[PDB]
């Protein structure tokens, strides 16, 4: 059952991202229950991403050294249990939830690092691109369903707690499948030398910084904008926040698919016009995404619908680059340094962005809110002001992509010379 194995792997990835983003949709309830501020809310995602980055390389090394299936299934079970246990935490305690988020990060890093290897080892033909395509499409759908399930479970059960209790169960079932169906899969100095040679690749460094900016934007936005929309509805007379998160997730999944598709199409069209089309299309998309991510805050007060269309277009643009960055990395770097290059790029993108970026946004929100008077209007304005920083980082990432475009051909030439000589 190789096809069933791929299907269950995709379902497990969906559940992985569902568990990752279930907290974002129910952030208001957690913050109100534990009596914490925006800083404490950020801590959750910040610690999760820190754990993910610190754990993924370990899990890759262990997967190539030890059985992949055992690690994958044990991870499924591990974060499922961690989530279901974190559902039960005394309101007085707060750090236990952060520890649970970190452990879920460990497990989800295990999965995100091992599952692609299994998907590849099951089968290597050109049809492998399609199977990996569905595996990766599990990502935006997973995030959208995370928001949807958070909102819906919170509304139906009557307590936010159950938002962390339904998802675990399914995971375990998926775990029971990942071992039943999937069959057995078919130099420190070298790593140091590869790194020492990668830092001198200007396009690689600039693309890494640009994707770090993208990580910053994605993390901050996807973690805060549900609460931001609820705050916007609160400050205005028409107040909802489950519906806001529901609509955000529904837009998120569709926007992820459409953004990937449009990025691929724009790449295919613009390559014929000129080489170095990937960095340039990425940078243009980043500029547009920054413009509309800044437009969301202006549209919030006037009406929520305009903010939602701004979300749509900005998500489309910022999401399109997700499929082009990998092609950029592949084109720049030679095969001897591709694995190390990818690992370093992932680590740097998680470090410079998506790790502490939600915490930084929450800290800024707290700073403005405490410096000024405390009230729904001030809280809304402070969250908007903090989120204002994300467009600047997106513009920085776009400039980095433009720089990468500048050095693109020369770096290709050096790579070709290294390969040939």
Describe the structure.
The protein is mostly helical. The protein is 85% helix and 0% strand. The protein contains 17 helices and no strands. The PDB classes it as membrane protein. The entry lists the keywords spns2, Di-Gluebody, membrane protein.
Which characteristics define this entry?
Growth Hormone, Chain: A, 2 domains, mainly alpha, sphingolipid transporter activity, 421 residues, transport
What does this entry show, briefly?
The protein is mainly alpha-helical and 421 residues long.
- The tally of beta strands, per DSSP, is 0
Strand content: under 5%
Q: Report the total helices.
A: 17
Share of helix, binned: over 70%
* Architecture (CATH level 2) name of the largest domain: Up-down Bundle
Our count of domains comes out at 2
CATH fold category name of the largest domain: Growth Hormone, Chain: A
CATH homologous superfamily caption of the largest domain: MFS general substrate transporter like domains
Radius of gyration, CA atoms, in whole angstroms: 21 Å
The biggest sheet amounts to: none
- What gap, in angstroms, lies between the N and C termini? 45 Å
Structural class: mainly alpha
The CATH class label of the largest domain is Mainly Alpha
Helix-strand pattern, N to C? HHHHHHHHHHHHHHHHH
The 3D shape can be described as globular
PDB class: membrane protein
Keywords: spns2, Di-Gluebody, membrane protein
Assembly: monomeric
Entry title: SPNS2 in complex with homo Di-Gluebody GbD12 - SPNS2 local refinement
């Amino acid at each position: 059952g190789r096809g069933a194995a791929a299907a269950i792997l995709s379902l497990g990835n969906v559940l992985n991202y569902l568990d990752r983003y279930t907290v974002a949709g129910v952030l208001l309830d957690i913050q109100q229950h534990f009596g914490v501020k925006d800083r404490g809310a950020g801590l959750l995602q910040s610690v999760f991403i820190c754990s993910f980055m610190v754990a993924a390389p370990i899990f890759g090394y262990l997967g190539d050294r030890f059985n992949r299936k055992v690690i994958l299934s044990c991870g499924i079970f591990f974060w499922s249990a961690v989530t279901f246990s974190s559902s039960f935490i005394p309101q007085q305690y707060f750090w236990l939830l952060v520890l649970s988020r970190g452990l879920v990060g460990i497990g989800e890093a295990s999965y995100s690092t091992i599952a692609p290897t299994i998907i590849g080892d099951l089968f290597t033909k050109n049809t492998r691109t399609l199977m990996l395509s569905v595996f990766y499409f599990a990502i935006p759908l997973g995030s959208g369903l995370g928001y949807i399930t958070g909102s819906s479970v919170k509304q139906a059960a009557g307590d936010w707690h159950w938002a962390l209790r339904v998802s675990p169960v399914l995971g375990m079932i998926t775990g029971t499948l990942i071992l039943i169906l999937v069959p057995a899969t078919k130099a420190r100095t070298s790593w140091l030398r590869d790194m020492k040679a990668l830092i001198r690749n200007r396009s690689y460094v600039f693309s890494s910084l640009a994707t770090s900016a993208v990580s910053f934007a994605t993390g901050a936005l996807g973690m805060w904008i549900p609460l931001y929309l609820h705050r916007a509805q609160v400050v205005q007379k028409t107040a909802e926040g489950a519906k806001d998160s529901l609509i955000f997730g529904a837009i998120t999944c569709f926007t992820g698919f459409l953004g990937v598709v449009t990025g691929a199409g724009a790449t295919r069209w613009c390559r014929l016009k000129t080489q170095r089309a990937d960095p340039l299309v990425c940078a243009v998309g980043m500029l547009g995404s920054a413009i509309f991510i800044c437009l969301i805050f202006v549209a919030a007060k006037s009406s929520i619908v305009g903010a939602y269309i701004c979300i749509f277009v900005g998500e489309t643009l910022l999401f399109s680059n997700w499929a082009i960055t990998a092609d950029i990395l592949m084109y720049v770097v030679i095969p001897t340094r591709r694995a190390t290059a990818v690992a370093l790029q992932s680590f740097t993108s998680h470090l410079l962005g998506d790790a502490g970026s939600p915490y930084l946004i929450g800290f800024i929100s707290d700073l403005i809110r405490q410096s000024t008077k405390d009230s729904p209007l001030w809280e809304f304005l402070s969250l908007g002001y903090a989120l204002m920083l994300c467009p600047f980082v997106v513009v920085l990432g776009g400039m980095f992509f433009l720089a990468t475009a500048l050095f693109f051909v020369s770096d290709r030439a050096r790579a070709e010379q290294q390969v040939n000589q």
